Short mmCIF file of C-alpha atoms and ligand atoms in Angstrom, two decimals:
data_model
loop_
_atom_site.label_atom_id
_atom_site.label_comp_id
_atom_site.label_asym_id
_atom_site.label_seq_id
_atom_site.Cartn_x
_atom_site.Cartn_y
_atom_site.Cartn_z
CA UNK A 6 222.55 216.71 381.99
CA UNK A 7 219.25 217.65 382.13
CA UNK A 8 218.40 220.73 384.36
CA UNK A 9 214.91 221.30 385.93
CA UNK A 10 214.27 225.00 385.66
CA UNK A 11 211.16 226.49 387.23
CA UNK A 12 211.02 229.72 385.26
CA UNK A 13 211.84 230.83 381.32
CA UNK A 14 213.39 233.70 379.82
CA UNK A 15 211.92 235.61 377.52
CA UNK A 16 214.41 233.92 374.71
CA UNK A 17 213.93 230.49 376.35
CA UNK A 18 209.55 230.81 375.81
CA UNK A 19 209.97 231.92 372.27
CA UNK A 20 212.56 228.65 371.68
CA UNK A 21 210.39 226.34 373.04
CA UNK A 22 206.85 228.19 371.22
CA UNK A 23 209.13 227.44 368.06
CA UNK A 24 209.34 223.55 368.86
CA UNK A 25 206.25 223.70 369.30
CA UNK A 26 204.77 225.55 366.52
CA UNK A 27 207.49 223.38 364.35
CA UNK A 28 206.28 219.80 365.47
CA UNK A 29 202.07 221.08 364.81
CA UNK A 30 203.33 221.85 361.31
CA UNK A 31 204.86 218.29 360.88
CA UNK A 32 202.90 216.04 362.87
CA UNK A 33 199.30 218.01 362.36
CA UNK A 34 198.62 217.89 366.28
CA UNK A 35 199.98 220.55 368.57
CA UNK A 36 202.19 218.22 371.05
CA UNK A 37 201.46 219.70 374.30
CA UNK A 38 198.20 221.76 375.13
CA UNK A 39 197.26 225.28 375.43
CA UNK A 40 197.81 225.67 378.99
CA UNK A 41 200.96 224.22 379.13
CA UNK A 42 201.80 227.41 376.35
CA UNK A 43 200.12 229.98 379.28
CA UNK A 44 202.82 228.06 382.09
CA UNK A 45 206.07 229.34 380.10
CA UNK A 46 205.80 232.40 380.92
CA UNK A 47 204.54 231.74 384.83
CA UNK A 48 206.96 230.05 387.54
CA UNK A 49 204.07 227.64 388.72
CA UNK A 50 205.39 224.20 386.97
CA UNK A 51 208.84 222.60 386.11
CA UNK A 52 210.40 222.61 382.46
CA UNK A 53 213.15 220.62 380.84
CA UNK A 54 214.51 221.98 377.59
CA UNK A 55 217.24 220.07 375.97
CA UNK A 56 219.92 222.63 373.25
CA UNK A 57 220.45 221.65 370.40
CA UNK A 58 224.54 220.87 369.24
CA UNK A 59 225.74 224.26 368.51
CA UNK A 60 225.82 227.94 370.17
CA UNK A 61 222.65 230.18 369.04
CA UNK A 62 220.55 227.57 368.28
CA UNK A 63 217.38 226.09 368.52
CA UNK A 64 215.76 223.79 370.73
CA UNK A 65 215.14 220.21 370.59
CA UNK A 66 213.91 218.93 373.04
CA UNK A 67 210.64 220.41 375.68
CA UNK A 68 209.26 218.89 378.79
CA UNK A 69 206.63 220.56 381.57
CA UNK A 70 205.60 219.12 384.48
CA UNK A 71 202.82 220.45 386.29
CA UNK A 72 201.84 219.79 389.88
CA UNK A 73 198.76 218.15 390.52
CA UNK A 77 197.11 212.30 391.97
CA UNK A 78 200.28 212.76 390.31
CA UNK A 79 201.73 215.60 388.46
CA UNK A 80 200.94 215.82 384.77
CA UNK A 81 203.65 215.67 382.01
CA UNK A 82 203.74 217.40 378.20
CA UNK A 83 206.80 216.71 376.00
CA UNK A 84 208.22 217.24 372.77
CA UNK A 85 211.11 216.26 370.50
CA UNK A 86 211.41 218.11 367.24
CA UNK A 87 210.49 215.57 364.41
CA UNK A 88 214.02 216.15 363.29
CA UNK A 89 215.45 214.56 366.31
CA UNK A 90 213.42 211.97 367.12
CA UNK A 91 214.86 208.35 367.33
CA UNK A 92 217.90 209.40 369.38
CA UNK A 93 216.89 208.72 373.19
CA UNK A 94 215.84 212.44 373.96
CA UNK A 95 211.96 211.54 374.45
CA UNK A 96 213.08 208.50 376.73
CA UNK A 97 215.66 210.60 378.46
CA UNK A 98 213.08 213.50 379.57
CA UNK A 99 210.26 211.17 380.62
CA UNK A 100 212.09 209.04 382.93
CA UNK A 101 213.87 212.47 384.37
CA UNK A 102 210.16 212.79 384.89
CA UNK A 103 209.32 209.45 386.29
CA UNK A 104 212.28 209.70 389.08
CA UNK A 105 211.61 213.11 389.83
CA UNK A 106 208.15 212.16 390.69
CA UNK A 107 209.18 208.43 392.09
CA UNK A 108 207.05 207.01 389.22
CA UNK A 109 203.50 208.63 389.97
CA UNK A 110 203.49 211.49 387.04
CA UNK A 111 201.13 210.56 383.72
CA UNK A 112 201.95 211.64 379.85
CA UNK A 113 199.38 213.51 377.73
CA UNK A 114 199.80 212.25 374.54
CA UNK A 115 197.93 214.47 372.55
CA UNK A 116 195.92 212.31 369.47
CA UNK A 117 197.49 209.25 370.40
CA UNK A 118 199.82 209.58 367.73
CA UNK A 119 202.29 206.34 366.51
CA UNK A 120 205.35 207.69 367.92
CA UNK A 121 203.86 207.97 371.47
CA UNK A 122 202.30 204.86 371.67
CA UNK A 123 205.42 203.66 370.32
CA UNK A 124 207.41 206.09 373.12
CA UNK A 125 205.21 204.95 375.70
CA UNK A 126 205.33 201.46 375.13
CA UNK A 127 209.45 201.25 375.41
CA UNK A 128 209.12 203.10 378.69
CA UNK A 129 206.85 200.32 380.05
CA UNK A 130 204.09 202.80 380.58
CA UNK A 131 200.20 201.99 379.61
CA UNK A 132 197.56 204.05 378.70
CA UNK A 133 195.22 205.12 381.88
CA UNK A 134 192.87 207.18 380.85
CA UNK A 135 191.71 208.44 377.30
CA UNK A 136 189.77 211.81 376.85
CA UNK A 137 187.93 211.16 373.00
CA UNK A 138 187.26 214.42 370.97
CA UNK A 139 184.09 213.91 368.99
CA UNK A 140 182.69 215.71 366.33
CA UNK A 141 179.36 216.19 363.62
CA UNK A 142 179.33 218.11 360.70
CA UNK A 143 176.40 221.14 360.91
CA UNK A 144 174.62 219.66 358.28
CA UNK A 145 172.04 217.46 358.65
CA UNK A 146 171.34 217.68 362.43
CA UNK A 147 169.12 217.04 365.00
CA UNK A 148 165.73 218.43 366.53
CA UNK A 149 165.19 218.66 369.86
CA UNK A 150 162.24 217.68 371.69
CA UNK A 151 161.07 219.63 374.30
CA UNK A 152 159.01 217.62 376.77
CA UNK A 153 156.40 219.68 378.73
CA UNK A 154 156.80 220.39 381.92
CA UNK A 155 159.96 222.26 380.80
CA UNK A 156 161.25 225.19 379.28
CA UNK A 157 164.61 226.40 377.77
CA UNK A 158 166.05 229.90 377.78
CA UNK A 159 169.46 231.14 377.72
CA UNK A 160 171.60 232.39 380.75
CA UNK A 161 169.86 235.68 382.45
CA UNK A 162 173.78 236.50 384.33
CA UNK A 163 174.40 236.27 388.19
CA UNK A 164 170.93 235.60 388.71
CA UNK A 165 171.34 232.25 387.50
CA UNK A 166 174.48 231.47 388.86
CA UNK A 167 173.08 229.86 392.48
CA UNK A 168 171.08 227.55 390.29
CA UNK A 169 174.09 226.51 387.85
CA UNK A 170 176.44 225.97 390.40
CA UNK A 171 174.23 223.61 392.41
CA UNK A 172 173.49 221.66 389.28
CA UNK A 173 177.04 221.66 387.98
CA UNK A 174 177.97 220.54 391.35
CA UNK A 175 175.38 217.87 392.01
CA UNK A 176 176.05 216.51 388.04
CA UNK A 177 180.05 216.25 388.68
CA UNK A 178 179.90 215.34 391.94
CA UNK A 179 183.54 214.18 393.11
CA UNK A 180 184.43 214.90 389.71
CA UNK A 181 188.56 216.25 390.21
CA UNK A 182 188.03 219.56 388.02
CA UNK A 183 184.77 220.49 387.20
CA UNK A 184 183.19 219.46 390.68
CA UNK A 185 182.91 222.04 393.48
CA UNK A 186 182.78 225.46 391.48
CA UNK A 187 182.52 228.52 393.09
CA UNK A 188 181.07 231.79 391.48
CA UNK A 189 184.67 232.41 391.73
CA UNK A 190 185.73 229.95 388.70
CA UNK A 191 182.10 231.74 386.82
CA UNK A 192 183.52 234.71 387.05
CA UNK A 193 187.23 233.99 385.27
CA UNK A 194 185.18 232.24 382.46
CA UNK A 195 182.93 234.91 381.72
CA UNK A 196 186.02 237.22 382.02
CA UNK A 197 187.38 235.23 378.65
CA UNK A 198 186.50 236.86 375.42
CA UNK A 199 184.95 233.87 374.47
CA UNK A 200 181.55 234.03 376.66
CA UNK A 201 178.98 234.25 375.29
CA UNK A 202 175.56 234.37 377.58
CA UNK A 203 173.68 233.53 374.64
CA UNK A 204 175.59 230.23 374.87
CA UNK A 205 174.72 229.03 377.62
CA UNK A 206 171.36 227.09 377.33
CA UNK A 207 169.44 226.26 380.24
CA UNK A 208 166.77 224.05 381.10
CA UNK A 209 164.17 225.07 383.79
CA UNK A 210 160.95 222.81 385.11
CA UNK A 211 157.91 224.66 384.31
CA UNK A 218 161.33 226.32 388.31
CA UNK A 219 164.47 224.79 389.32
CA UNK A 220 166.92 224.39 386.91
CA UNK A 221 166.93 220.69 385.44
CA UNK A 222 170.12 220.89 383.14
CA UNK A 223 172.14 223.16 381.22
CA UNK A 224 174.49 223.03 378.11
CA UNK A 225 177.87 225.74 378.19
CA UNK A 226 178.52 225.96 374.53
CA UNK A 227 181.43 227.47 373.02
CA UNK A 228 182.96 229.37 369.97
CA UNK A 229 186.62 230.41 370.19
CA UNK A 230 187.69 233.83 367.89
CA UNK A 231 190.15 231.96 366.68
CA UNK A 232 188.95 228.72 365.52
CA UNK A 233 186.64 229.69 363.08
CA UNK A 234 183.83 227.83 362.00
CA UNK A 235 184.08 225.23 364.99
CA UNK A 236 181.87 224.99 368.13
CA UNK A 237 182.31 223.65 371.21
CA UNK A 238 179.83 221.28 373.72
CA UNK A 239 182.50 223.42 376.40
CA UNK A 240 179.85 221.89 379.84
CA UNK A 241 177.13 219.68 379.68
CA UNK A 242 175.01 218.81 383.06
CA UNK A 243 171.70 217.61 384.17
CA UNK A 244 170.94 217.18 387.72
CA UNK A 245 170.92 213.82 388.74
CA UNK A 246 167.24 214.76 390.50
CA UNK A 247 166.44 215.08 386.73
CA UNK A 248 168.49 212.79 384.84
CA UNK A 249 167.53 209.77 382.53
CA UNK A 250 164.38 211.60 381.05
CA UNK A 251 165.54 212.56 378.06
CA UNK A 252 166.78 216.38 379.24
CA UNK A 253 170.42 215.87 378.22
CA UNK A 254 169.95 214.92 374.78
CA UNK A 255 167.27 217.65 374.36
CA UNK A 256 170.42 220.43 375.92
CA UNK A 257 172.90 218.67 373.47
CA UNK A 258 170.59 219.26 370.53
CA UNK A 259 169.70 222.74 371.55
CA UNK A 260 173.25 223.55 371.63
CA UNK A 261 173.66 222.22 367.90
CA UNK A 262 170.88 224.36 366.63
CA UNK A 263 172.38 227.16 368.78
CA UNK A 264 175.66 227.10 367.63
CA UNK A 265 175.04 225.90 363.54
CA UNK A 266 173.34 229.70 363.47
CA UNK A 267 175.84 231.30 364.88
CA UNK A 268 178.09 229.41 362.83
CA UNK A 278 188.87 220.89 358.34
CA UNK A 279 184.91 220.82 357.70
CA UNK A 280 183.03 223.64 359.83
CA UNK A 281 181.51 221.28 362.79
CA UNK A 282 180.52 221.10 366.45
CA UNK A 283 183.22 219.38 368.44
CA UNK A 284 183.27 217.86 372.42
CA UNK A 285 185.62 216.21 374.66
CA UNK A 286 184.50 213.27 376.92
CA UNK A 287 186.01 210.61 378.89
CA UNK A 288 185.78 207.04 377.25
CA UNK A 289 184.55 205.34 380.13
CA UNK A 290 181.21 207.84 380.46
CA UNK A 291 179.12 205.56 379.87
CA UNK A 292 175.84 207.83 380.01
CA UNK A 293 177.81 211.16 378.21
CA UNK A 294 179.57 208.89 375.35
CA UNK A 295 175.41 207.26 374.42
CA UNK A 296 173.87 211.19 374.36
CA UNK A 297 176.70 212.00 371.98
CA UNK A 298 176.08 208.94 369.94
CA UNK A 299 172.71 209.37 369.55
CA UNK A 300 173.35 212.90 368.45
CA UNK A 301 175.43 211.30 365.10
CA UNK A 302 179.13 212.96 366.95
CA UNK A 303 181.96 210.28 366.03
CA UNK A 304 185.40 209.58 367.19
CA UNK A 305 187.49 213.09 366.09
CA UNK A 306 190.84 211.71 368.18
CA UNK A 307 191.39 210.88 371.56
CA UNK A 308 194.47 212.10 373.80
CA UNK A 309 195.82 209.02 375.95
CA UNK A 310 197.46 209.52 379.38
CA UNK A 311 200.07 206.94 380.23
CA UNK A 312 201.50 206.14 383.35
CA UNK A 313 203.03 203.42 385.10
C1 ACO F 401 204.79 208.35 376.70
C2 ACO F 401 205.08 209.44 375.68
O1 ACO F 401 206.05 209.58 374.93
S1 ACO F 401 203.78 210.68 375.67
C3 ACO F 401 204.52 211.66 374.36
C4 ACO F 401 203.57 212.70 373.98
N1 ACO F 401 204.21 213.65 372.96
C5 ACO F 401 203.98 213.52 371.70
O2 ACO F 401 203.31 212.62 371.15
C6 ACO F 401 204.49 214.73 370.91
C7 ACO F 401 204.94 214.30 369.48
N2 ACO F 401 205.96 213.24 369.55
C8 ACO F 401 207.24 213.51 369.98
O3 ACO F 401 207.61 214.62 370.34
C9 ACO F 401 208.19 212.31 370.01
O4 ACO F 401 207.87 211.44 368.90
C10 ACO F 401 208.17 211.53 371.36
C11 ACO F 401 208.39 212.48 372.53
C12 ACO F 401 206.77 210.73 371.51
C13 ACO F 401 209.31 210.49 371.41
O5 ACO F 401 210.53 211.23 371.31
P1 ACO F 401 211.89 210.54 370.76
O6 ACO F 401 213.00 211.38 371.19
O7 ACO F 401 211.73 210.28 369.31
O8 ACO F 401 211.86 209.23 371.59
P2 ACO F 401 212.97 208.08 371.70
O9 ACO F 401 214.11 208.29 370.68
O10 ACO F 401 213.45 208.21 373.11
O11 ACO F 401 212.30 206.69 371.37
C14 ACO F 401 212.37 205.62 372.33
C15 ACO F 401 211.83 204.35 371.65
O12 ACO F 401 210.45 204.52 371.27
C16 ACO F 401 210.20 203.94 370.05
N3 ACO F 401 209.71 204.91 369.06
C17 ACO F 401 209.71 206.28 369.17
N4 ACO F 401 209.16 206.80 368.09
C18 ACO F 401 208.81 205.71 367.28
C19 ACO F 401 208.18 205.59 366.02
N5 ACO F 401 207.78 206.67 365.31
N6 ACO F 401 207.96 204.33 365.48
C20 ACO F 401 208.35 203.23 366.19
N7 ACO F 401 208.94 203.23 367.40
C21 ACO F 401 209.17 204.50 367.93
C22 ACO F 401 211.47 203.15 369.74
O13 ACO F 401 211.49 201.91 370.50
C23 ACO F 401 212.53 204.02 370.33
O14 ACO F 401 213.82 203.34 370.36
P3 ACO F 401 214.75 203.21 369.00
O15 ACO F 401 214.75 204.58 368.42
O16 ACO F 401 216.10 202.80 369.49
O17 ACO F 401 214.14 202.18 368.08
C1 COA F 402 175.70 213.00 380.50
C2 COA F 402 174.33 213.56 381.08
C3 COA F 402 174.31 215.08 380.81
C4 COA F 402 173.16 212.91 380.36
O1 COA F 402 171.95 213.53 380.83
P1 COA F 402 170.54 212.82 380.84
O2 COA F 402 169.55 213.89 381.10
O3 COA F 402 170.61 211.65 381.79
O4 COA F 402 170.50 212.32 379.34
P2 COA F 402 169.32 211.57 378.59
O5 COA F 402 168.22 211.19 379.55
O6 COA F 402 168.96 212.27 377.39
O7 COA F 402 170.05 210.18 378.20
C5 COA F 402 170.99 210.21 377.13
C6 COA F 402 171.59 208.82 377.04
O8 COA F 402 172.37 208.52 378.18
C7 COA F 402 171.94 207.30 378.83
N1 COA F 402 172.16 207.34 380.26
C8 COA F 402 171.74 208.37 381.07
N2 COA F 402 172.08 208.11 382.33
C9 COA F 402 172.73 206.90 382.29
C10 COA F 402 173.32 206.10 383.32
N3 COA F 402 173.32 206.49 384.63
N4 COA F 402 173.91 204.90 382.98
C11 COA F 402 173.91 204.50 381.65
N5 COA F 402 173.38 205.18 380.63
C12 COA F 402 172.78 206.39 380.96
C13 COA F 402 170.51 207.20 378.35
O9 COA F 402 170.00 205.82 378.44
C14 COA F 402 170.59 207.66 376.92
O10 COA F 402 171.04 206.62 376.07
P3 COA F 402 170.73 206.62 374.55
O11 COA F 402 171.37 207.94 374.05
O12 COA F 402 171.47 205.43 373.98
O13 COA F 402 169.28 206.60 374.34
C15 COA F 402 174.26 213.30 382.62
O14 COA F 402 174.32 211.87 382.88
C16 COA F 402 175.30 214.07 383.46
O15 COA F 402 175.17 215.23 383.76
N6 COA F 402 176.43 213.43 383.67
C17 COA F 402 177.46 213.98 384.52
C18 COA F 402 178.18 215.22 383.90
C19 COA F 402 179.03 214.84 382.69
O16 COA F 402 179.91 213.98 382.77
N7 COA F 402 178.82 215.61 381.59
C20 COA F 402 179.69 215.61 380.33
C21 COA F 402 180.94 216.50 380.50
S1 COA F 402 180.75 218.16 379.80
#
C-alpha cells in the first residue's frame, strides 16, 4: 500500500538522501533535483517512500510530488530494485492522485526512464537541454557603440533589471513577473556574486543583462544562471555580446572545467546565441506526461 505522507522524519530524510546519494553513484545523474532535496525536510509537497523487505532497513523506493499546470513529479528506485513494478507502481499512484495531469522529470533522459515512461504510455512534453563549452578557446565579444557594459552597481539597478527581466520573459511561468522580492532571496545565497552580473546599458536604459553563476561547491564550473535582452533591444547582436562577456567573466574567475547553461529546446532565438558561442548538447532532462 502506498501511503502519501506530507512530512518526513528526521530518519525518514536521511533514508531517502541515501537512495538518492546511492542511485548518483550508480547511474552518474542525481535522480531527482536539488530542490526536491530542500522539500524533505519542509511539509509543502507530497512523498511516497516504499521499505524495503525487512525491519531496520533501507529504502527503495522515493517519490515527491510538488504542487504546481499540473503538479511536478521526481522518483527513484534504487538500481538494485529496479525491474520489479516499484517505478510503475509510484507513478501511476501519481497519475490518479492527480487524475492524470502531473509530469515526470527525468533527469538526463536516461534509458531506464525513457524505457519507464514509455510502458506507462506517457510522452515526453517538454525537454530543458544543458549545454556546455570548454574555457579554452573562446569567444570575443564585440561591443557595438552606442553601448556600454559594466557590472551590477546593487539596488540601484534593480528598477532597471526587473523591467528588462520582465519585458524579456514576458508570460514566461517562473522567471516572468519578479519582484525585488525574488532579488533579494538570490542575493541572500552565498553564491552572488555582483561582479557576476553583467549589464548592458545604451550610451542609458538598460538594453540586456547576463546573471552568471559559480556555485562553492562545483568547482571549476560556471553557470549562464539569467540571460535577457529587452525585446525594445533585441536582434542587434546584444545577447551574444552578454553571453560572451559572461565567458570571459567567468574563465578568469575560473569532468573538464567549463561554462554550462540550461535552455528550453524549443527557444528558438536562446538555443542559436548558444550555438554560435561553440556550447553543445551536455544532457537534457525530459518531462513526460500524458
Ligand atoms: C516516466 C519515468 O519513469 S520518469 C523517471 C525519472 N527517474 C529516473 O530516471 C531516476 C533513475 N531511474 C530509476 O529510478 C528507475 O530506473 C525508474 C524509476 C525510471 C523505473 O523504476 P523501476 O522500478 O525499475 O520501473 P519498473 O520495474 O516499474 O519498469 C516498468 C517497465 O519499464 C521498462 N523498463 C524499466 N527500466 C528499463 C530498462 N533499463 N531497460 C528496458 N526497459 C526498462 C520495462 O518495460 C518494465 O517492465 P519489465 O520489467 O516487466 O520488463
Ligand atoms: C535569447 C535572447 C537573450 C537573445 O538576445 P538578442 O539580443 O536577440 O541576441 P542576438 O541579437 O545576439 O541574436 C543571437 C541569435 O539569436 C537569433 N534570434 C534573436 N531573436 C530571434 C527571434 N525572435 N527568432 C529567431 N531567432 C532569433 C539571432 O538571429 C541570432 O542567431 P545566430 O546566433 O544564428 O546569428 C533574447 O531573445 C531574450 O531575451 N529571450 C527571452 C529570454 C530567454 O529565454 N533567455 C534565456 C533563458 S536564461
Amino acid at each position: 500500500a502506498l501511503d502519501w505522507r506530507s512530512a518526513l522524519t528526521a530518519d525518514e530524510q536521511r533514508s531517502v538522501r541515501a537512495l538518492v546519494t546511492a542511485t548518483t553513484a550508480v547511474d552518474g545523474v542525481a535522480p531527482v533535483g536539488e530542490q526536491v532535496l530542500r522539500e524533505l525536510g519542509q511539509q509543502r509537497t507530497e512523498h511516497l517512500l516504499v521499505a524495503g523487505s525487512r525491519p531496520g532497513g533501507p529504502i527503495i523506493g522515493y517519490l515527491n510530488l510538488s504542487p504546481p499546470g499540473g503538479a511536478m513529479a521526481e522518483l527513484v528506485v534504487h538500481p538494485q530494485s529496479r525491474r520489479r513494478g516499484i517505478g510503475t507502481a509510484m507513478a501511476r499512484a501519481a497519475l490518479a492522485k492527480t487524475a492524470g495531469r502531473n509530469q515526470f522529470w527525468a533527469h538526463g533522459t536516461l534509458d531506464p526512464a525513457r524505457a519507464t515512461a514509455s510502458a506507462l504510455g506517457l510522452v515526453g512534453v517538454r525537454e530543458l537541454i544543458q549545454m556546455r563549452r570548454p574555457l579554452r578557446d573562446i569567444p570575443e565579444p564585440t561591443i557595438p557603440d552606442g553601448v556600454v557594459i559594466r557590472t551590477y552597481a546593487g539596488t540601484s539597478d534593480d528598477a532597471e533589471l526587473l523591467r528588462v527581466n520582465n519585458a524579456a520573459f514576458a508570460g514566461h511561468p517562473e522567471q516572468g513577473g519578479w519582484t525585488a522580492v525574488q532579488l533579494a532571496e538570490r542575493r541572500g545565497e552565498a553564491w552572488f556574486d555582483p561582479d557576476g552580473l553583467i549589464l548592458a546599458f545604451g550610451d542609458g536604459r538598460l538594453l540586456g543583462f547576463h546573471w552568471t553563476k559559480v556555485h562553492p561547491d562545483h568547482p571549476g564550473l560556471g553557470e549562464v544562471y539569467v540571460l535577457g535582452v529587452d525585446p525594445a533591444a533585441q536582434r542587434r547582436g546584444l545577447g551574444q555580446m552578454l553571453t560572451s562577456i559572461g565567458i570571459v567573466s567567468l574563465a578568469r574567475r575560473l569532468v573538464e572545467p567549463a561554462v554550462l547553461l540550461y535552455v528550453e529546446s524549443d527557444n528558438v532565438a536562446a538555443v542559436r546565441t548558444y550555438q554560435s558561442l561553440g556550447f553543445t548538447t551536455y544532457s537534457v532532462d525530459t518531462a513526460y506526461a500524458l
